[model samples]
Target: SMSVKKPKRDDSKDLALCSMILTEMETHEDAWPFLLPVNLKLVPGYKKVIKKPMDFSTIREKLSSGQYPNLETFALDVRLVFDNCETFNEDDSDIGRAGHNMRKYFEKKWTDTFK
Candidate 1:
């Protein structure tokens, strides 16, 4: 199993699919149940504990250290890092916008292929 390594790609694909999905789901609320299966297949050993679809609102621990941020309904931590990432915009706007990559990841090319 791949443990840890400083990425040589200097790009976001270098991130594990678990991390990618986690990060992406944080920003894109359109994410859904399908993402669960995809994440399971993509992230082999250690991707668990989470149970939903999501977006990105990040808190600077330096600032939002002790704030209890959560929604009464969704319990979304308002300070969570939920926002559109530039990597999702890197040359595949269609897949990014459609969340198709979240499903296929590799249909045409490897813009968002497996880890």
Candidate 2:
């Protein structure tokens, strides 16, 4: 009989990419309201608790439960971030550096925690 091993899941790159997108989105004043739905849906157990006020504990519990249906949703949110990044001013180096630094932090954290 042949033995099989499950492939290790790597969320580090995904997290870094997501963080970069979010940083870019946050630089836009108009993105706040439009991103709310993306935020809520990305929360764990969104279908159940999204109608009520959100808290970090509930979200953490959902994540700890090892049930993350929101990965695809998060990918969509990342796409939205990229879509909006180009609309910002090219001369806005401050915001650009912020996004770049956040991406670096995310990568470092992911490596330390998950790698």
The digit string of per-residue lDDT tens for model 2 on 1-115 reads 2687688687556544544544554455543323333354564554553333322233334344644354554434343333333333243565445444444543464355445
Residue 60 in model 2: shift from native, Å? 9.5
- Candidate 1 on 3-109: residue-level lDDT in tens? 87775653343224323434544355454422333344565442343333233233222113434322111223311112122222343555355454343332222
Estimated TM-score for each candidate:
0.19, 0.33
Q: What is the Cα root-mean-square deviation between model 1 and the actual structure? A: 15.2
Q: Rate the local accuracy (lDDT) of all candidates.
A: 0.34, 0.43
| Full-model lDDT, candidate 2 | 0.43
Q: After superposition, how far is residue 95 of candidate 1 from its true place, in Å?
A: 16
lDDT score, candidate 1, position 84: 26
User: Model 2 off-target regions past 4 Å?
Assistant: 1-3, 7-67, 70-92
